[PDB]
With several copies, the nearest count.
Chain A
Amino acid sequence: EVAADVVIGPVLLSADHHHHHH
């Protein structure tokens, strides 16, 4: 078992919890 844990981030999202498509 040759393996590793890899972390990606921080992925930053918008602060607008009401954001929607045009």
Chain B
Amino acid sequence: TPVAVQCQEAQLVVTVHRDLFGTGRLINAADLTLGPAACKHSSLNAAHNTVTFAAGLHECGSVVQVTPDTLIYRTLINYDPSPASNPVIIRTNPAVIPIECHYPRRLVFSLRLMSDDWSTERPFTGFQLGDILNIQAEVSTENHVPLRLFVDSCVAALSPDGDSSPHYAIIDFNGCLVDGRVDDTSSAFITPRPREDVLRFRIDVFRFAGDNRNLIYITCHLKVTPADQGPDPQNKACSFNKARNTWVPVEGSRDVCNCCETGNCEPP
């Protein structure tokens, strides 16, 4: 391959061949960056036409997933060609190369991207518009009492910072899946839950206008209450159903979702 990744103790070192597409045509070093933060290269090797990136495991907008036995750090190499002689045309396409580092591990919340049958976890690549993201939120089964898990908000963006522009709220107002309210989406929480401390939901795939990297990050605010406690306008998981024109909670009284339509579920 044209990309070599060294997963070291507390950094990763990525070496990229400037002959990135095996055509023999060399890309510009300055057109390659690391992570959604677009960090610049740390060194070049002219003799071998390579470009090297070195970053701490938490730097440059990397994302960590904590599994029972493993820590997985995911990032990417961005190739963004400099302008053609006349910028209205493109002679060379951009590209994104996913980078991953796995480490044995030495309340914990987690989000996992599941296959459509929810049997297994699936790759983060190979989505096309028309596809559905199946997201499973969960919270570790620590000794402590039985819990119920909610997702207060999820925001999509072009980097792990959901406050950056552009961004798009998928879940808002303390558990209202607002993406399901509009257009022709089928986005919704799944019912019933597998367990009270697991919450599943599906989102129609989308992408951000004007973004030529064609990727998204989703950042969610997860929280728990005691398992037994009644859902209320502050703690709930509601979906909109266009057919019936109504909000519907995963559990609890129908009217707990009323605030979803008004766009404010804070209690004053």
Show the binding face of A for B, using Cβ within 8 Å.
1-22
Contact = CB atoms under 8 A, between A and B. Distances in A.
A21 B130 contact: yes
B110 A12 contact: no
B63 A7 contact: yes
Contacts of B103: none
A7 B163 CA distance: 13
Contacts of B23: 21
B94 A6 contact: no
Q: Interface residue tally of chain B, by bracket?
A: 35 or more
Given A12-B125, A13-B215, A15-B214, A4 B94 contact: no
A10 B113 contact: no
Interface string B216-244: 11111111100000000000000000000
Interface in B89-122: 93-96, 98, 107, 109-113
Nearest to B135: A8
B22 interface: yes
A15 B92 CA distance: 11
Interface in B179-236: 205, 207, 212, 214-224
B219 A14 contact: no
A2 B142 CA distance: 14
A8 B128 contact: no
19 contacts: A3-B221, A3-B224, A4-B222, A5-B219, A6-B109, A6-B111, A7-B217, A8-B218, A9-B217, A9-B218, A10-B76, A11-B205, A11-B217, A14-B125, A14-B126, A15-B128, A17-B212, A18-B214, A20-B93
Nearest to B35: A10
Contacts of A1: 223
